[PDB]
Amino acid sequence: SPNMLVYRKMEDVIARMQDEKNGIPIRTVKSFLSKIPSVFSGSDIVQWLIKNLTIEDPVEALHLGTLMAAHGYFFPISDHVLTLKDDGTFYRFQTPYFWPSNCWEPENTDYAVYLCKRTMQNKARLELADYEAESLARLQRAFARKWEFIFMQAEAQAKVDKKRDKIERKILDSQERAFWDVHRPVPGCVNTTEVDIKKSSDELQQQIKYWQIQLDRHRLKMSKVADSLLSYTEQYLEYDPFLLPPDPSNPWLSDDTTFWELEASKEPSQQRVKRWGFGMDEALKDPVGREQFLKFLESEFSSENLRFWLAVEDLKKRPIKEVPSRVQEIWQEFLAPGAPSAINLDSKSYDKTTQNVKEPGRYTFEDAQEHIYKLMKSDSYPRFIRSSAYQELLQA
Amino acid sequence: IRASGLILLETILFGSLLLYFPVVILYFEPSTFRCILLRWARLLGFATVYGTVTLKLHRVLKVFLSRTAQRIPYMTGGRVMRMLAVILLVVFWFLIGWTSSVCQNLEKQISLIGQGKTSDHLIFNMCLIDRWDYMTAVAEFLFLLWGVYLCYAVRTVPSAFHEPRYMAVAVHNELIISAIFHTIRFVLASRLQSDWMLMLYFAHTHLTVTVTIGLLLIPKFS
C-alpha cells in the first residue's frame, strides 16, 4: 500500500526528531499565571528542520513542517486546527498508539462518546466550539436509542483517569483531544486522511533467446547519449521560451498576441527557416516546410516520392471503413506496375507489397515507406538545404 | 414565546415601563418626595429587567446539560420567579434603610435635598447626592459583570433564534452607558442646571430602555 511508505518515511523523520542526544528539548514553561511543563515553541521546530534538513527556504521548511503537523505528529496546545506557526506557542508530539499510521478509523458512536465526556468533565462552560456543538446536536437527534452506556463509560473513564495524578489527566486528555482533531477536522482545513479510489484496491530456449536478444540489443555509450541530449537541447536551447527566448513577446506574461499570430502567418520567420535546416522530419512536421519542399520538388520535376509518403501518412489517418478503398487504389496508382506514379521497389519490398496488398492493413506499406523514406532523407533534404531558395528565404 | 416564557416578558416590559419614570419626574419641581421616588423606581426597574434576563441565560446553560444527560426538565419557568423574589426582597430592605435614615432623622431636623448651587453667580436648585448613590452604582456594575461571564461561556450552543447575541449585547451596552452616565453626574454636582441634566437622563433612559426592549422583543416577529 503506497501511503504506508510515506508515513514510514515521516516516522523516520520524527524518530530522528525526538532523538536522545540530539533533538528538540521538551521544556517546562513557568508563567505568572501557571507552570506548564513538556512543551516547546514552533521556532524551535523550525530551527530543528533548518539545521538537520538544510531546507534553504524558511518558507519551504515551514511548508514541510505544516503538512507534517497536519498529519498528527505535533499540534498547537490551544487550537483545534493543526497549523505550525513559527512563533512562541506550545506544541507536543503524539503517542505511538495514536499515530495515523495505525489504520485507525473512528465512527459516529465514538464521536458521541468523546462529546459526552468533554462536555461532562468540567461543567463550568460549554467547553467546545460551535462546529463540535453542532455535531453533538445531530448525534443526539439521530442516536435516540443508544446514549446511556456512552455517558456511563465516559464518566467512568473520567474517574479512571482523574484518579491518576493531575498532570497526567492533563497530558492524556490533551493528546486524546488532538488525535480527534486530526481525524475529524474543522470545516475549513483539508482532511489529511483520504485516499484516491485508484489506490482503493524449450523453456530455457525462450530464456536463452531472451539472453541472445539482449546480446544483439545494440547499445551505445552514455557519453554518446550525453552528446545527443546536450546537442538536442542546444539546437533549441535558444528556442526555450522559459530559459532564454529571443522573441520577448510573451502572450502570457507581456499581454501580447503577436508571437502566436506570427506563428499563424504562413511566411516563415528566420528562426523558422534556421529550424527547418536541422532535419526534414521537422520540415514535414511544419506545414510551411511541406509546402516549400513540395514547391522545390515540383519545379525540379521531382515531386513524387514526397507525394507518396504524404499518401501513406494520409492513409494512416482514416478508419477501417476506407482502408481497403485506398490500399487497392493506391496500389493501382503508385504500386501497380504500369501506373504513372512509379514507386520503385526491390525484391523483398515488392514481394511484401504484393502479399499484403490483398489485405488492407494499418501497417501495410512499412518496408516500402522505409525504403523511400531513407531515400528522401538521404538525398532530397540535403540539396534542399543547399538550395538557393532556402538560402534566399533564410536571409530574410 | 414557548421558547421564551410569556411571563418573563411581561415582567420585563412592566418593569422597564416603570424605569421610564426619572424623566416625567424632573419636570415637576424638586422636593423631598421626588428624589426618594426616583431611587425607588430606578432600582425596581433595574433588577426586574437586567436580573431576570441574566437568570434566563443561566437556565439556558442548565437545560443544556440536563438535556444532554436525561431530558427531565431540569429548570422550568416555574424556577425563575423564585430566584427573582430573593433579589426583589434584598433591594426592599435596602430602600428601607436609606428611606429610614431620611424619614426618621434628617427629614425636618437638620438636612434636606431640595437644594441649589450656583454656576458663576446664578441660582439653580435640584436633588443631590451622598455616598449611597456611589455604592449603588458599584453594585450595578458588579451584577452585570456576573451576567457578562455568563454570556461569555455561553457562546457555542446550537440554538434556535440566537437569543444569546441579542441579550449579551444589551448587557454590554448597558454596563458601558451606565458607567459613563454615573461618572459624569457624580463629578458634576456643581455645573448642572435642570436642562443639561435632563439631557443626561433622557439619554440614559431612551438608550437602554429602547435597546433592551427591542433587541429581544422585535426579532420575534421576523
| Rounded-to-integer distance, Cα B67 and Cα B70, Å | 5
Q: Are A29 and A39 a contacting pair, CB within 8 Å?
A: yes
The residue type of B47 is A
**In chain B, which among 48-67 make CB contacts under 8 A with chain A?**
61, 64-65
DSSP classification of residue A6: H
Name the residue in chain A with its Cα closest to that of B156: A130
Nearest alpha carbon to residue B112 among B130, B135, B132, B87: B130
Residue in B130, B126, B133, B125 with CA at minimum distance from that of residue B105 = B130
* Cα–Cα distances in angstroms (integers) from residue B5 to residues A366, B13, B73, B77, B161, in the given order: 93, 13, 14, 7, 14
Is A136:A119 a contact under the CB 8 Å cutoff? yes
Q: Which residues of B touch A123 (CB under 8 A)?
A: 65
Judged by CB atoms closer than 8 Å, whether chains meet at B158 and A134 is answered as yes
Instruction: Decide if A27 contacts A81 (C-beta within 8 A).
Output: no
Inter-CA distances, A354 with A23, A324, A366, B30, Å: 78, 14, 13, 130
Contacts of residue B1, Cβ cutoff 8 Å, sequence gap at least 6: B9, B220
Q: What residues of A are in contact with residue B149 (Cβ under 8 Å)?
A: none
Joined grid coordinates for residue A215: 546480446
Enumerate the β-bridge partners of residue B148.
Answer: none
**Residue A118 in contact with partner chain B when CB distance is under 8 A:** no
How many Cβ atoms from other residues are within 10 Å of residue A296's Cβ?
Answer: 18
Cα–Cα distance measured from residue A92 to residue A74, given in angstroms and rounded to the nearest whole number: 5
Nearest to B208 by CA among B184, B182, B183, B172: B172
Give the Cα separation of B61 and A222 in Å (integer): 77
| CB of B74 less than 8 A from some CB of A | no
- Resolution as reported, in Å: 4.7
Which residue, among B156, B157, B159, would best test binding to A if mutated, counting the most A CBs under 10 Å from its CB? B156
Task: Please state, in angstroms and rounded to a whole number, the distance separating the CA atoms of residues B187 and B19.
Answer: 23
- A129 in contact with B at a CB cutoff of 8 Å? yes
Closest CA to A10 of A97, A66, A55, A71: A71
Report the DSSP beta bridge partners of residue B217.
Answer: none
Q: Which set of grid coordinates corresponds to residue A316?
A: 494512416
Q: From the list A126, A130, A134, which residue is nearest B64 (CB)? A: A126
Cβ partners under 8 Å of residue B75, min gap 6: B58, B59, B62, B63, B66
Residues B157, A133: C-beta atoms closer than 8 Å:
yes
Phi/psi of residue A57, nearest 5 degrees:
-75, 120
Residue entry with cell 493506391: A330
Measured between alpha carbons, how far is A232 from A335 in angstroms, rounded to an integer?
A: 37
* C-alpha distance from B130 to closest chain A C-alpha (Å): 39
Total H helices, total E strands in chain A: 18, 2
> Can you read off the three cell numbers belonging to residue B98?
436609606
Q: Which residue, among A392, A396, A395, A374, has the nearest Cα to A296 in the 3D structure?
A: A392
The alpha carbon of A286 is separated from its chain's Cα centroid by a whole number of angstroms, namely 30
φ, ψ for residue B125 (rounded to 5)?
A: -100, 165
**Interchain pair A123, B65: CB under 8 A:** yes
B220 to each of A117, A336, B77, B125, B160, how far by Cα in Å? 35, 95, 19, 45, 11
Chain breaks in chain A (C to N over 2.5 A) after: 201
Q: Do B61 and A128 touch (CB under 8 A)?
A: no
Q: Using CA atoms, how far apart are residues B13 and A39, in angstroms rounded to an integer? A: 53
Grid cell of A182 as nine digits: 486530526
Work out how many CB contacts closer than 8 A connect A with B: 30
Identity of the residue numbered A209:
K
